[PDB]
Design a protein around this ligand. Structure first.
Ligand code: FAD
Ligand code: FAD
Ligand code: COA
Ligand code: COA
Ligand code: NAD
Ligand code: NAD
Lengths: 443, 443
């Protein structure tokens, strides 16, 4: 057929779906309504623009609405879809331009509305030098503030935020990191959190742990941040305290939410409504270690959602088979990569789990320049089944984390990892690869 | 028990076996007879010493015969075992020192005699500035020649050799590489060979292809190299034309050779004689793709052989389960990694094979400094079974090859590779990893 595919949200989930659908079946009428007035850009690259290493913000955009148009996709920015006459039963889309508002119909709907920052209930948040890092607009705002230092406070030591702290330092500001839990990257076992505190401090960043941020002092400007632990002075504060999915429009139309709070889907990215798909940070994925639905808002998983929904719609056979949790980020001179479960969470889940954490090198002892490389394995006591792992390196990189993700995918044991024929040469790994030395193999 | 383990050869296969045996069962009497007067060193590091990046040759040694002594291991250098009174029936070792010669018995024998360079039959090979690169002594010779340039010719565009060309250039010589087949790294599909010719040329190496080297000109010195294609003047020539295993002693004593020419072994590193083990470059390994024995003289496989023999001898349980062919090397600004079969070889085996070869980046398009990264996939037409793969990068780091080796190990298809949850972040890979984009996925 030659029906009409309407995508709500044009960032990554949505742009993927739109592009793949149109390519796979050009008969389709493909239209994207994006509320933010930018479409198809790399939010992940924001801290590299902030820091100054990337010259202009437009460098993050993958496809422009003009290029899309050339490829038969119609994108409208600053268009918000406000209601859907679902089932119910189509019309459905009423959305809003500049000036007007209006109706449109759909045969296939892709809900790709993403996620918004989850702010903690703190008096003072509303003031003037308080910021959030999620969109190109947040990028513009912060980029305007940044020159004209001087003192920054970042609430939250997760990904945005560890990443932000590096950006701010490279811009001259003095930066103090306030985390509510007891280490940076609280979400993982604490050997990694340690290495990270050390690097952050090595670079001039002050890291407060166990902090109860009480309020942001000022008369609508902000100059302070009063905490249980004292008072941090600050003329720019970044709230980097987590995200939650944008499921609001979807609930209105009667799309089901899964246990995590994100929209539920199948291997086909289909929601509980015929005709309605979901993709990207709004959508749950199946976790292959935990064997249940799980929320993993990364950009690679949003592209995979997109591409599947799009393929399915254009009537190609395509399925999305889950995730395992692989993540990697850069904080100064560390590249930190986790996958699967940490030992904390593997015990919360009930496994009789143990960990091993070793430090090795990233090249032969004798090779000039070789740095350190640490690798953690989280496994089941008796079976030896892998359940998670980390590696941290300076490397561009390592990234050997991908081997563990491959093993997590099938069931995969420490014994399987041991048997692997990995690559060795003096510039790139010691003759026993850190993955192999970690395996069983040392403590 | 507390019997006597004699290791013939002390370089890597042998030193591993010696150290792990002694660790695992200190009762053992463990003695290593090494004919070269150096023991336990990283031959792989020689080109880095040649080039000057590593200051002194002793930096490549891992354990000294004094440190071995401390650990209960007796190493004798410059001792060549000349005969074995096998089965037959022990005595057996007659070997030779400085001065004398003498007997020794064994209860466990590890054959770890390695490989020697395989010279082509060219008149003039015997002259003065013609070299080979395999041992520490070869290192010293070359290191003596090198300052005092001027013009080098390297026969052979495989691994030693591609690696040597970089070393010699870094030392100022002008270098021209003569290969007999039609591309550098002829033993792999020719896209890689191409990328390599371009880099070598970009750095001032001349690469002659399809050359019939006919003789080395000189009056016992060498100044030339006469070829079918012209005459290369050269005052230093490196013969980098391959190696063959050292099976000579082993055959005398009636150890079986496998079809490759290397000593045959089981998963416990045992030869056909009770008591007699083989480890390292003299020993065959089971190839898991081809499902037969295969000769893969790499140093990580030599440590695996040796660690296994040692464990087994000390009475631990240990098995060596095979290889798949993973190899990585550095040639100027390229890191080149292969694993499995190439399309050429996969067809020669009979599979109905296809390739795909894509060029992607090593980090997001917008990320400053991100370089190119090429990945190759060799697969079976119908089943989709992976059969081999390459990736080439500048990266110290990629090395993503390890992923494909994980897949090769079980059977592992393109579909399997497609389902993997790889790591993404802008400094490290684009949002689709180059392994994914190569899967099925583009051509
Ligand atoms: C600073 C930063 C760094 C990051 N780094 C990484 C990284 O290193 N690795 C990684 O894998 N991931 C990273 N991410 C994650 C990445 O941003 C998201 O996973 C990714 O962009 C996928 O999002 P998506 O397309 O589902 O929706 P989003 O990108 O959240 O986009 C949704 C868009 O849809 C629009 N929309 C919402 N509601 C409506 C409506 N009612 N009508 C019309 N339009 C609507 C919104 O305007 C929004 O712009 C990073 C994110 C940030 C913010
Ligand atoms: C220049 C160069 C670069 C390399 N780069 C890499 C790389 O990047 N990656 C990689 O994985 N591998 C690399 N290798 C391979 C590596 O050298 C071998 O795989 C490794 O050293 C394993 O060898 P082995 O212990 O079986 O024996 P060898 O290292 O060949 O040692 C055998 C020793 O046994 C002694 N011996 C022989 N016969 C007798 C006898 N009858 N009596 C007593 N002693 C005897 C010999 O003197 C010899 O010194 C490289 C090799 C070279 C030469
Ligand atoms: S923080 C989130 C990360 N950033 C984002 O995801 C936001 C920007 N990305 C997007 O919005 C989408 O990914 C866009 C660019 C809108 C969707 O793009 P397409 O779906 O059009 O993607 P491409 O054109 O990149 O890829 C399509 C086909 O092209 C093949 N291919 C990609 N790269 C290569 C290389 N280097 N060499 C050979 N082929 C390549 C892909 O395999 C893909 O294959 P099809 O089978 O044709 O779809
Ligand atoms: S070109 C060939 C490459 N170079 C060579 O192989 C030549 C030099 N190598 C050798 O000759 C042998 O490998 C030697 C060093 C003689 C044999 O060494 P060992 O067998 O004694 O090796 P190690 O002492 O390195 O390792 C033994 C145990 O120690 C554990 N381990 C190593 N590295 C680490 C780190 N970074 N962190 C924690 N543990 C570590 C190994 O797991 C190994 O464990 P066991 O279970 O005790 O054997
Ligand atoms: N490289 C990557 O893979 C990468 C990088 C950036 C962003 N992202 C995506 O976007 C998401 C952004 O994560 P994030 O850093 O915003 O959230 P997060 O959940 O990863 O944060 C960890 C949290 O400890 C909690 N905490 C500390 N002080 C607090 C306080 N004072 N009040 C309330 N909470 C406090 C913090 O809020 C901090 O966010 C990531 O989880 C990821 O999905 C990915
Ligand atoms: N990084 C690594 O994985 C690495 C690096 C170096 C050495 N090694 C180990 O040691 C081995 C050494 O390999 P190599 O480079 O000596 O052999 P090779 O077999 O890999 O070499 C390829 C051959 O084409 C043949 N050729 C070109 N001109 C010729 C001629 N004129 N006459 C005869 N042959 C000619 C060359 O001889 C060249 O050797 C490797 O295979 C590997 O086992 C490994």
């Amino acid at each position: 057929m030659g029906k009409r595919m309407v995508v709500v949200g044009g960032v990554a989930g949505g742009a993927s779906a739109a592009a793949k659908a149109k390519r796979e079946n050009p008969e389709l009428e493909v239209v994207v309504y994006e509320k933010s007035g930018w479409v198809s850009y790399g939010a992940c690259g924001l801290p590299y623009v902030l820091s100054g290493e990337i010259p202009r913000l437009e460098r993050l955009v993958a496809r422009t609405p003009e290029e899309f148009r050339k490829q038969g996709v119609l994108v409208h920015t600053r268009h918000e879809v406000v209601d859907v006459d679902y089932e119910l039963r189509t019309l459905t889309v009423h959305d809003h331009a500049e000036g007007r508002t209006f109706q449109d119909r759909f045969d296939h709907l892709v809900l790709a509305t993403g996620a918004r920052p989850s702010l903690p209930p703190i008096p003072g948040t509303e003031q003037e030098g308080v910021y959030t890092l999620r969109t190109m607009e947040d990028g513009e705002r912060l980029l305007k503030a940044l020159p004209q230092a001087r003192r920054a406070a970042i609430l939250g030591a997760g990904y945005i935020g560890l990443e932000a702290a590096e950006a701010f330092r490279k811009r001259g500001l003095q930066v103090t990191l306030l985390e509510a839990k007891d280490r940076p990257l609280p979400h993982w076992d604490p050997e990694v959190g340690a290495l990270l505190k050390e690097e952050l401090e090595r670079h001039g960043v002050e890291v407060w742990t166990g902090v109860k941020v009480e309020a942001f002092r000022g008369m609508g400007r902000v100059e302070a941040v009063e905490t249980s632990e004292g008072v941090v002075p600050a003329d720019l504060v970044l709230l980097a305290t987590g995200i939650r999915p944008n499921t609001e429009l979807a609930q209105a139309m009667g799309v089901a939410l899964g246990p995590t709070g994100a929209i539920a889907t199948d291997e086909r990215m289909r929601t509980n409504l015929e005709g309605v798909y979901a993709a990207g940070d709004v959508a749950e994925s199946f976790h292959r270690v935990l064997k249940r639905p799980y929320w993993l808002p990364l950009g690679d998983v949003a592209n995979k959602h997109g591409r599947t929904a799009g393929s399915v719609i254009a009537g190609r056979e395509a399925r999305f088979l889950g995730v395992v949790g692989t993540a990697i980020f850069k904080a100064f001179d560390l590249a930190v990569a986790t996958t699967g479960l940490s030992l904390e969470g593997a015990l919360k889940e009930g496994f009789w789990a143990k960990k091993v954490f070793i430090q090795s090198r990233d090249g032969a002892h004798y090779y000039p320049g070789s740095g350190p490389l640490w690798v953690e394995l989280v496994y089941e006591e008796g079976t030896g089944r892998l359940l998670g792992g980390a590696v941290v390196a300076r490397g561009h990189g390592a990234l050997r984390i991908d081997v563990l993700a491959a093993l997590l995918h099938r069931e995969g044991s420490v014994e399987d990892l041991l048997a692997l024929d990995l690559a060795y040469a003096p510039p790139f790994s010691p003759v026993w690869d850190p993955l192999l030395i970690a395996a069983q193999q040392a403590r």
